[PDB]
Design a protein around this ligand. Structure first.
Ligand SMILES: O=C(COc1ccccc1P(=O)(O)O)NC1CCCC1
Ligand SMILES: O=C(COc1ccccc1P(=O)(O)O)NC1CCCC1
Ligand SMILES: [Cl-]
Ligand SMILES: [Cl-]
Ligand SMILES: [Cl-]
Ligand SMILES: [Cl-]
Ligand SMILES: [Mg+2]
Ligand SMILES: [Mg+2]
Ligand SMILES: [Mg+2]
Ligand SMILES: [Mg+2]
Ligand SMILES: [Mg+2]
Ligand SMILES: [Mg+2]
Lengths: 228, 228
């Protein structure tokens, strides 16, 4: 439905939708921009991520409310409406994963783009895993694992320990270990080593870069405090 | 799309969508319930109102952001995206007005239902008026006026001065006068007389009714403080 709109106009409208807190519109404009086929700049990658994290964040918060109500109840209505929300959440994750596979990851050659998109791949498989059951579910968990692992391998080779994309990746992979993979010790180890290696590299930063890095380090510390 | 779902299941799902903060779903379930053709109870009227006030409230807040950006700018993108949001807001107002006209108002014989639906009619024409221009716009303003006036006439004959529906009607009609009809003195007069007549009737109330009435009287007082 965005095929007839100029790429620059889709980007400009995504930014207006962000100001208006219209995140579903923002996601649809950024999906349109990706579908133009050109690589995304740093700023555009951030627009894409913000738009979908807000859309899926609303769906996840709703699904958690409904799942809690369903668990306490255990007619068909609660299950049906939790399934409705679940299906819509899955469809949003599948859309994001399709954009990453067609063809954002394969054209991303710089570390900062490749790590960003592989982190997104891990996050959206993780959202799929939160609602998955059984052993359809093992393969989804392993997909999230695999994407985070490839992102971490590149990040450790190509980026300084304070780079905010590297930090947010390690933060989200630590959440994956703690919440999805039932590996709280791996979560804690990863958040601690990430925090300590970043601390040791802060001295290399400008005031503004120091502010960006320490903000994410505080999120690692907030987790370690919840987890220990 | 809700034609195949039982009325009671639509009501139960509206309440679940409210807990999940899923207001578009809540509105669609309550539209489905109205379209079953049976009158709505007090609780169901409140579900219908909450659902649409939240949906349209999001659209109005967005439209105001975009309109402000558009005014400061004065390419086509800001106008186009403000028009998109405006059209969707109009469609939601038209849907609510259609439910009221087909056939909620005509079957509402008790004062509490009739006043509730005529207040809603005033509110949704008022939302249409906020975005309207010119003299297509005069007839919309007069439609909001007419609906509020009929509701006020019934409320004053049939309900005590502290009834919360009567109070919320007078509150919203005072907002109409101040914001839409360029009649700040009529706004202030109405909010003051409404406040003073309610104060004099508080002594007749239970503790719980007193809490419900004074909450809305505080909204009248907050307006009078903004306006004087
Ligand atoms: O409260 C949180 C905190 O989640 C995170 C904290 C640190 C890194 C990543 C997450 P994510 O699970 O991706 O939102 N997330 C809520 C957002 C919607 C449902 C869960
Ligand atoms: O800030 C308000 C206060 O509005 C009212 C105050 C008292 C009575 C009725 C209203 P309404 O204009 O119906 O939201 N409304 C914002 C909700 C979305 C855009 C405007
Ligand atoms: Cl459902
Ligand atoms: Cl490449
Ligand atoms: Cl548009
Ligand atoms: Cl009647
Ligand atoms: Mg072009
Ligand atoms: Mg399912
Ligand atoms: Mg490339
Ligand atoms: Mg039936
Ligand atoms: Mg228009
Ligand atoms: Mg009747």
């Amino acid at each position: 439905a965005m095929g007839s709109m100029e790429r620059a106009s889709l980007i400009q409208k995504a930014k207006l939708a962000e100001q208006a807190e219209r995140y579903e519109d923002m996601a649809a404009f950024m999906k349109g921009a990706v579908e133009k086929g050109e690589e995304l700049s740093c700023e555009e990658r951030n627009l894409l991520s913000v738009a979908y994290k807000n859309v899926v964040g609303g769906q996840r918060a709703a699904w958690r409310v409904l799942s809690s109500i369903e668990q306490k109840s255990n007619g068909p209505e609660v299950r049906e409406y939790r399934e409705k929300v679940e299906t819509e959440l899955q469809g949003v994750c599948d859309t994001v994963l399709g954009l990453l596979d067609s063809h954002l990851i394969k054209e991303a050659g710089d570390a900062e783009s490749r790590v960003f998109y592989l982190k997104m791949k891990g996050d959206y498989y993780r959202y799929l895993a939160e609602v998955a059951t059984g052993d359809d579910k093992k393969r989804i968990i392993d997909s999230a694992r695999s994407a985070y692992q490839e992102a971490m391998d590149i990040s450790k080779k190509e980026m300084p320990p304070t780079n905010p994309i590297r930090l947010g990746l390690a933060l989200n992979f630590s959440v994956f270990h703690y919440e999805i993979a039932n590996s709280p010790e791996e979560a804690i180890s990863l958040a601690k080593t990430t925090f300590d290696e970043a601390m040791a590299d802060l001295h290399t930063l400008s005031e503004d870069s120091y502010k960006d890095s320490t903000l994410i380090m505080q999120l690692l510390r907030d987790n370690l405090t919840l987890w220990t």
